[PDB]
Design a protein around this ligand. Structure first.
Ligand SMILES: Cc1cc2nc3c(=O)[nH]c(=O)nc-3n(C[C@H](O)[C@H](O)[C@H](O)COP(=O)(O)OP(=O)(O)OC[C@H]3O[C@@H](n4cnc5c(N)ncnc54)[C@H](O)[C@@H]3O)c2cc1C
Ligand SMILES: Cc1cc2nc3c(=O)[nH]c(=O)nc-3n(C[C@H](O)[C@H](O)[C@H](O)COP(=O)(O)OP(=O)(O)OC[C@H]3O[C@@H](n4cnc5c(N)ncnc54)[C@H](O)[C@@H]3O)c2cc1C
Ligand SMILES: CC(C)=CCC/C(C)=C\CC/C(C)=C/CC/C(C)=C/CC/C(C)=C/CC/C(C)=C/CC/C(C)=C\CC1=C(C)C(=O)c2ccccc2C1=O
Ligand code: SF4
Ligand code: SF4
Lengths: 92, 282, 438, 73
């Protein structure tokens, strides 16, 4: 709600059929992870840990790369979106 | 082989062109201009018509000098040629003025390849979503207008006649169009391809054929603000909708259901539903 | 049909286009592959771009970029602000010879790299946007012989491949370099806002006029005790306000890195400057800044492959010289390949000269200097936690006139500084940082 | 306040350095610190030292910081 007000300002070409943020193992995010640093350090609120699993709202991804690096267990299959997709920064 | 001409329009990216309430204007500065998304389906159909029947597809745009980058993004689909109608004689044009320029733009294309067997436009541009250029272009040429195309069945290149599925409000309808026709493509026809590199690299080092108002031979004041009958006198953003009120609550388990139909009938628009007349008329 | 090129430069940032500028000016069929819609579409930078690494690339750079919208508000004043609870210690330096011999311009990188792509295109390079490189096509010798893309028929053949793709070294790890991924101490999460401030409040709050710019560097307790160097730059009709903090500090604080930008907007001083021009945010960005440097960089060379820019982790983030290092690294890689093209050898015997040019120039000497800089800043948490808020209350007490007889303000400052930290902590910390500055 | 800065201007009269070299040297040092010209940041940390220890010796800099310390008490 709060940061998706500011993500509305950015320009995107969303690739909804190709999620570039896949989580390799959902069970590592349930019992192996304690603090979930992918949620607390994502500048775009992409990751939200529900009890249904991890909700990865990849459409707002700013392609920074923090989630892949801050994740201690490596279970974020992180790619850039394809060419002409993802954030399209105007006056970046 | 057929001759296809795809009239595309460079449109600002209206997914990002948003309303700023505090300046009360469209914040469309910095937002790059793209193909009209109704025309990416027209270009993808034209590239399908090029790999199935070998139709020489041209793409034409009457726009600003910055609209040569939209004409290069159309060559990435695999198209043969792009044509730019770039002149500020054409600036501020309306639909009658655009169609008069586009009729004489395609008429010069007809002096190069032959009589145009098919004209593909989009259903609407998004800036000024009128959608009358496609209908207007079928009248200048005297071509069969198949508008709001959702499917393409038999595109018989031997009988010079194809079957489309036009969407109307009572339902879709199959139509045996007679070529030469002017189609008008919606979003639901196809999904545009991810372009390959040999066409995208060719799209980068491509220069669209620029034609001014002297190149076409048209009347010098039948195309701009003078050939425009209508005049846009004022553009103004809409209001901030209208604050509502929690008709029901989290207490009423269902008693909120008739309180919805209580407060539906206070609105004018429920006459328009075509299925809530037995609760409004009675 | 084979798409044949001489060099393929992956990435169209500062190091990608400066590498492609020298190859295209020297007559090489060089292709640039950028995964954005235009060059600059994925690039985040607050803006201070220094004109000397570009006057080595383009000696007529300030004439070509004056008419355009690439550059933005020539930087004549560089401030450093120590934000307190309510005060600020501005330590600026305005120089007026920077008005006619410029040192730096503020930029917006979608406006700069789109113009810089147009000069690289005029130089003779084919810039291919909307195209992400996935891996490298290899010959049976096992070396990088080109580039495969996400496009359907996408396989670009080249005698060399320049991996100028910035931070997130995804493509560097495919080339065998970067034997591990980035750990969250080699990078800093940098969250930036571009705020629309209408061209005359920019003149008023920065103390400038008429395409002359000022840069603020913000320190204080808005960064929650972590070493975050925020910034506040003057664009033409805008203000690019952002903040960057290390990932190790951000992970163990768990505070959502746009909140630091909200602590930076809602400071009493920044909310005084931009009063209600704070919430007309035009854009919200996020990126990473390489901060490991010398201890964390890859092998920057290989068989038919070079690595420039942030992909080689060449960033002096304490001086904010990353584009300074990137545009130079493109020039050193392109001059290495121009040696490689007259000899025809592209292996590690000739392409090791790029690593020799990288340490004979300023790029690796700035990395050796601030090598143990952020591990020094991580083992205090004092220089941005007590030290700005104490220097603000001391200088406020120094300027407050309340009938206190100036010896009892010279000792109330001493009772201020030797209460939040002992004198064995103050005199230690001045030279404990001296080892970080070398 | 008068006893504190009692011997303040006789201290300032017997230097003529704090407004004669000291501002113009702190300006050329901070300009060299912010100037980016491809100089590898050790050769700007020593060009500042070659700036400060050329207009006044180090026996004059470290003396003048506490010679004024007697003026500020
Ligand atoms: C706020 C505003 C309101 C406007 N209102 C009107 C109005 O009420 N009536 C009116 O006639 N004009 C109007 N115009 C101007 C009008 O858009 C131009 O005359 C233009 O030529 C028609 O574009 P359109 O929005 O009608 O698109 P449409 O006609 O809906 O576009 C349909 C298809 O026609 C083709 N096409 C459209 N424009 C071009 C072009 N320039 N070159 C080539 N092919 C093209 C494309 O394939 C496109 O997908 C308005 C403009 C603005 C800014
Ligand atoms: C908030 C912030 C502020 C900064 N401020 C300053 C400053 O004031 N001064 C300064 O000197 N430096 C500054 N920097 C640093 C500067 O942005 C970088 O150090 C430098 O500009 C990066 O150059 P690059 O060539 O690596 O380009 P990058 O922008 O890092 O990336 C190059 C390009 O590679 C492309 N790419 C990536 N992967 C692929 C792929 N697989 N296929 C194809 N293309 C790909 C991307 O689209 C990108 O455009 C700042 C950085 C940040 C985050
Ligand atoms: C009479 C005279 C002595 C008055 C003193 C005034 C004094 C404050 C400045 C001039 C004195 C000179 C002679 C000192 C020599 C060494 C100087 C250059 C040390 C630099 C540290 C500070 C004080 C710089 C001034 C503030 C402002 C101009 C900074 C610009 C903003 C950006 C570009 C710089 C970022 C930056 C910051 C924020 C650092 O904290 C830091 C710490 C250690 C090394 C480098 C840096 C650094 O580059
Ligand atoms: S960090 Fe790795 S483990 Fe912890 S939650 Fe995110 S993904 Fe699951
Ligand atoms: S990339 Fe940056 S934004 Fe996209 S998810 Fe990982 S962290 Fe959140």
């Amino acid at each position: 709600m709060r940061i998706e007000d500011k993500l509305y300002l950015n320009r995107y070409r969303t690739d909804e059929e190709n999620p570039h943020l896949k989580i390799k193992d959902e069970s590592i995010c349930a019992e192996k992870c304690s603090d979930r640093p992918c949620v607390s350090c994502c500048p775009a609120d992409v990751y939200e840990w529900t009890e249904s699993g991890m909700e990865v709202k990849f459409e707002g991804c700013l392609e920074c790369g923090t989630c892949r690096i801050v994740c201690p267990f490596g279970n974020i299959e992180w790619n850039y979106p394809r060419g002409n997709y993802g954030v399209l920064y105007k006056f970046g | 082989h057929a001759n296809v001409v795809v009239c595309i329009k460079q449109v600002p990216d209206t997914t990002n062109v948003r309303i700023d309430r505090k300046t009360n204007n469209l914040v469309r500065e910095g937002v790059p201009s793209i193909i009209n998304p109704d025309d990416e389906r027209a270009l993808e159909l034209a590239s399908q018509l090029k790999e199935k029947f070998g139709a020489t597809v041209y793409v034409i745009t009457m726009g600003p000098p910055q609209a040569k980058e939209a004409l290069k993004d159309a060559i990435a689909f695999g198209l043969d040629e792009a044509v730019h109608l770039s002149d500020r004689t054409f600036a501020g044009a309306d639909t009658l003025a655009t169609t008069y320029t586009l009729y004489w733009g395609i008429k010069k294309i007809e002096e190069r390849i032959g009589k145009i067997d098919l004209i593909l436009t989009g259903k609407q541009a998004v800036d000024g979503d009128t959608g009358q250029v496609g209908p207007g272009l079928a009248t200048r040429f005297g071509y069969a207008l198949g508008a709001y195309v959702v499917r393409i069945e038999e595109i018989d290149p031997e009988k010079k006649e194809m079957v489309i599925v036009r969407r109307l409000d009572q339902g879709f309808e199959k139509i045996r169009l007679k070529l030469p026709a002017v189609l008008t493509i919606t979003d639901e026809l196809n999904k545009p391809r991810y372009a390959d590199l040999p066409n995208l690299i060719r799209a980068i080092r491509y220069e669209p054929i620029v034609w001014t108002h002297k190149d076409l031979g048209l009347d010098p004041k039948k195309c701009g603000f003078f050939g425009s009958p209508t005049r846009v006198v004022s553009t103004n953003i809409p209001p901030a909708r209208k604050g509502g009120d929690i008709i029901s609550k989290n207490e009423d388990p269902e008693v909120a259901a008739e309180k919805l139909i209580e407060a539906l009938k206070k609105f004018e628009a429920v006459r328009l539903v075509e299925a809530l007349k037995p609760v409004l008329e009675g | 049909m084979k798409i044949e090129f001489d060099v393929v430069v992956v990435g169209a940032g500062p190091s990608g286009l400066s590498c492609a500028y020298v190859l295209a000016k020297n007559g090489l069929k060089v292709a640039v592959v950028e995964k954005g819609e235009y060059p600059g579409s994925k690039n985040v930078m607050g803006g201070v771009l220094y004109v000397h690494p570009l006057k080595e690339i383009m000696p007529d750079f300030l004439e070509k970029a004056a008419n355009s919208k690439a550059l933005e508000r020539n930087v004549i004043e560089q401030n450093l602000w120590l934000l307190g609870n309510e005060g600020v210690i501005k330590i600026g330096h305005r120089n007026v010879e920077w008005k006619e011999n410029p040192n730096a311009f503020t930029v917006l990188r979608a406006n700069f790299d789109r113009w810089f792509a147009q000069e690289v295109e005029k130089a003779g390079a084919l810039i291919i946007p909307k195209t992400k490189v996935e891996d490298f096509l290899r010959n049976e010798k096992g070396e990088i012989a080109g580039v495969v893309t996400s496009r359907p028929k996408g396989e670009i053949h080249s005698k060399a491949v320049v991996i100028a793709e910035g931070v997130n070294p995804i493509l560097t790890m495919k080339a065998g370099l970067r034997k591990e991924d980035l750990k969250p101490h080699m990078v800093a999460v940098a969250v930036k806002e571009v705020i629309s401030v209408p061209e005359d409040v920019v003149n008023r709050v920065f103390g400038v006029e008429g395409n002359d710019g000022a840069t603020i560097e913000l320190l204080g307790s808005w960064s929650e005790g972590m070493f975050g160097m925020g910034f506040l730059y003057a664009n033409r009709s805008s203000v690019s306000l952002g903040c960057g903090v290390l990932l190790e500090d951000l992970r163990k604080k768990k505070i959502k890195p746009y909140q630091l930008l909200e602590n930076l907007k809602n400071h009493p001083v920044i909310s005084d400057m931009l009063g209600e021009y704070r919430n007309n945010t035009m854009e919200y960005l996020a990126h990473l800044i390489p901060e490991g440097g010398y201890y964390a960089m890859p092998k920057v060379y290989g068989d038919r492959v070079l690595v420039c820019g942030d992909a080689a982790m060449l960033v002096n983030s304490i001086h904010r010289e990353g584009s300074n290092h990137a545009i130079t690294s493109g020039r050193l890689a392109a001059e290495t390949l121009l040696e490689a093209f007259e000899k025809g050898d592209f292996s590690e015997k000739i392409l090791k000269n790029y690593y020799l040019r990288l340490k004979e120039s300023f790029i690796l000497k700035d990395l050796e200097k601030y090598k143990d800089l952020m591990p020094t800043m991580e083992k205090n948490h004092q220089f941005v936690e007590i030290y700005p808020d104490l220097a603000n209350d001391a200088l406020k007490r120094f300027l407050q006139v309340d009938g206190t007889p100036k010896w009892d303000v010279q000792k109330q400052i001493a009772d201020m500084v030797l209460s939040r930290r002992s004198l064995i902590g103050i005199s230690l910390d001045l030279l404990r940082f001296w080892r970080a500055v070398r």
